[PDB]
Amino acid sequence: GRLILEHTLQGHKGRIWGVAWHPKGNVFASCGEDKAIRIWSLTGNTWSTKTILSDGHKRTIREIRWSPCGQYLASASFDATTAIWSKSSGEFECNATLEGHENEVKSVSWSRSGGLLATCSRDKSVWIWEVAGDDEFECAAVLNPHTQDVKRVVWHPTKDILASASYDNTIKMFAEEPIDNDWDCTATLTSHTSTVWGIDFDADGERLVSCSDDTTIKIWRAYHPGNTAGVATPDQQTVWKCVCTVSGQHSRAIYDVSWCKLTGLIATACGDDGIRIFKESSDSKPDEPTFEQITAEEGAHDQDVNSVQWNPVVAGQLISCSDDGTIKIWKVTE
Amino acid sequence: PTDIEDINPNVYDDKREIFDLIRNINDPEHPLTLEELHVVQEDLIRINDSQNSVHISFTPTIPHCSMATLIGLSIRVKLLRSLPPRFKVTVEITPGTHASELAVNKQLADKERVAAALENNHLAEVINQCIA
C-alpha cells in the first residue's frame, strides 16, 4: 500500500483540531486553538488560505462541517456556541449562533438533505436543529441519554438517523418516531472499553466504524427484522452488533476515523502521531469481517493526529491535521 | 470527582529533574508543597526516554480528596510548560489511594478535556498560582 504526502500546510498558531472538505472537493476548512477558521482554495497545485474567519468564537474551535449544499459552514466551539457561517451579502459572515449547551460544544453534523443539524456537548446532551429559512434555526430535540461528555455526532449518509459517540464509552443512534414525531434513541452500541472519539458510516449506512481511547477500532453492522444471519431483531428495531474489533494496531488513543464513501477505505488518526489505512479483505465474512492494514504512516505528524477525512470527490485524497500545527494532504493508492 | 473543566469558586477565592519540576508545586488548599504532603515522590516517577514517555503517580492525602483532579492538572501543566513537545506525559493517581482513582485518571488523560479546562479563566489562574 501507498500513503504519499502531497502537501504540508500551516497557518494557524498552535494546535489544529479539525479539517473539513467542502462538498465540491476543491476547498477545505480548518479550525483550532487560535479561534479562527481558515478556508483553503486550490489554484494550480498550490493550496493557500483564501479567507480567515476570525472573531466568531471566544475559545478553541473544535470542529467544523460544511452543509451538503456548500453554502453553510458550522463551527463548534469550547465557548458553548455553534456558529453558522454563510455568504449572505457576501463574503463569509456569521449569520446565526446556536446556543443552549452549558459547556463546550464538541461536534456538529448536517443531515443528508441539509434540513437538520446536530450538535453535542460536554454537558452530556445532543441537540437537533431544524433548518428553515435563510439564517434561522429552531430546536427540535434535546437528547439526554448519554451519561458523560459527548464527543462526536454524525448523520447517516442517506436517512435521517444520527449517531453519537461518548466519553461514557457508548455509541447511540437516534430517529423520529412516526406518531409523535419526537426524536428518540433506538440503539446503544456497547463493546468499547473507553471513550469513543470517532464514528463514521460506510457508503450506504449499513455499517459503522468507531475508534476509541481503548486503542481499538470496531465495525458495527445493522441487522434488520427479516434477518438472514439469525440475529434477533426485537421490536423490529434495527440492532447494531459489533462484528469486528481491530486490536493491537494502535498504541495510544485513536482520536478520529473516516470511512471513504467512494472507495470504502478507512482512515484513523492516533495519539501516537500515525495515520493508518485499512481495507476489508476480498474474502471477508459479512458477519465477522476481516479488515487489514494496507498501508500506514507512523510518522505522519510530529504530534497527535486529531482528524482525518477522505475527500468526498477525489477518491484516495486524504486530509489530516495535528497538534503539531500542520495540515497534511495525502494521496492513497492501493 | 467533578468535571475537570470546572472549578469551585471557593478554591479560587531523567527521574530526578522531573521531581525537581514538580516537588515544589503548592497544594491548592493547604500552605505546603506537594512534596511536603508526600503527594509527589521521586520514586513514583517513571521516565522512559527510550519511548518519549513520562508517567507520574500522585497520592492524594485522603482517599476522598476533592482536589485530586486539580492536583493532577497542575502537575500536567507544569510539565507541559517545561518539557520538549515530543514527550507524552501521563499523570495518574497512585493505585488504591483514592476512591474514584479510575475516574480521576480518565479525565487527566483526556487531552480535549484538559485543554478545555485550561481555557477556564478561573481554573487557569488557580493552576498558575500553584506552579509558580
Curated annotation (Swiss-Prot), chain A:
Gene: Ciao1
Gene Ontology cellular component terms for the protein in this record: cytosolic [4Fe-4S] assembly targeting complex; metallochaperone complex
GO biological process, one term: protein maturation
Residue windows of the WD repeats: 11-50, 56-95, 100-139, 145-184, 191-230, 249-288, 300-334
Protein name: Probable cytosolic iron-sulfur protein assembly protein Ciao1
Xref: Pfam families: WD40
Post-translation changes: Conjugated to URM1, a ubiquitin-like protein.
ATP-binding in keyword set: no
Keywords assigned: Repeat, Ubl conjugation, WD repeat
Family: Belongs to the WD repeat CIA1 family.
Function: Essential component of the cytosolic iron-sulfur (Fe/S) protein assembly machinery. Required for the maturation of extramitochondrial Fe/S proteins.
Cited InterPro entries: CIAO1/Cia1, G-protein_beta_WD-40_rep, WD40/YVTN_repeat-like_dom_sf, WD40_repeat_CS, WD40_repeat_dom_sf, WD40_rpt
Swiss-Prot record, chain B:
Protein name, per record: MIP18 family protein galla-2
Gene3D superfamilies found in the cross-reference section: 6.10.250.1280, Fe-S cluster assembly (FSCA)
Keywords: Cell cycle, Cell division, Chromosome partition, Mitosis
Subunit structure: Component of the CGX complex composed of crb, galla (galla-1 or galla-2) and Xpd. Interacts with crb (via intracellular domain). Also able to interact with Xpd in the absence of crb. Interacts with Mms19.
Family listed: Belongs to the MIP18 family.
Pfam families tied to this protein: FeS_assembly_P (PF01883)
InterPro entries according to UniProt: FSCA_dom_sf (IPR034904), MIP18 (IPR039796), MIP18-like (IPR002744)
Additional record remark: The name 'galla' means splitting in Korean and is derived from its role in chromosome segregation.
Organism expressing this protein natively: Drosophila melanogaster (Fruit fly)
Gene Ontology process terms (BP): cell division; chromosome segregation; protein maturation
Origin organism lineage: Eukaryota, Metazoa, Ecdysozoa, Arthropoda, Hexapoda
Keyword Iron-sulfur annotated: no
